[PDB]
């Protein structure tokens, strides 16, 4: 737990992605891919992206980074109750796109940088620790998912 006022400063800064949700997908997936290219891997639809301009110009990696930022958002608008919408997540991402925890600890921070990045004003010493603490409550939920479907904790 956040308290109401972390969980309003996290709400706050969200609104500054889904004014662009798209746009903030493509550079959290490319900042990911830059500063762990082992992410890369999992991602059948790029393996064969070779540079940031082909990354750049991929369209399923736009619409993929989309799809992430849109659940993200989800998540969080629960405030920490996002039980249900957790599960489909956890059970998709142990089975079946087989995502390591670490990995999620490498797209929180992608998203930091790109939060930091793009909004600066908007995210100054206040937003920057809501924010982390949203994401570490969200990755150690999956953990638990993770650890209680069987899988590598
Ligand atoms: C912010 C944390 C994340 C959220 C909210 C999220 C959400 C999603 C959602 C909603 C989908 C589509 C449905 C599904 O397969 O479950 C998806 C697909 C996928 N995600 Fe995750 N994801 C996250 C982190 C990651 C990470 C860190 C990786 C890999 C390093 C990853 C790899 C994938 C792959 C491989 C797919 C299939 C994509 C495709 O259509 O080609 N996800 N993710």
Redesign the pocket.
């Known amino acids: 737990g956040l308290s109401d006022g972390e969980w309003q400063l996290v709400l706050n800064v969200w609104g500054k992605v889904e004014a662009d949700v798209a746009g903030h997908g493509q550079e959290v997936l490319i900042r990911?891919f830059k500063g762990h290219p082992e992410?890369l891997e999992?991602?059948?639809?790029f393996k064969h992206l070779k540079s940031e301009d082909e990354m750049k110009a991929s369209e399923?990696l736009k619409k993929?980074g989309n799809?992430?930022l849109?659940?993200?958002g989800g998540?969080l608008k629960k405030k920490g109750h996002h039980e249900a919408e957790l599960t489909?997540?956890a059970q998709?991402?142990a089975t079946?796109?087989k995502?390591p925890v670490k990995?999620?600890e490498?797209?929180?921070e992608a998203?930091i940088q790109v939060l930091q990045s793009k909004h600066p004003g908007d995210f100054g010493a206040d937003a920057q620790g809501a924010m982390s603490k949203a994401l570490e409550l969200?990755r150690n939920d999956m953990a638990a998912k993770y650890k209680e479907l069987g899988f590598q904790g």
């Open positions: 990911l992410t999992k991602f059948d639809k399923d993929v799809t992430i849109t659940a993200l998540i489909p997540l998709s991402h079946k796109h995502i990995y999620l490498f797209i929180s998203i969200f």
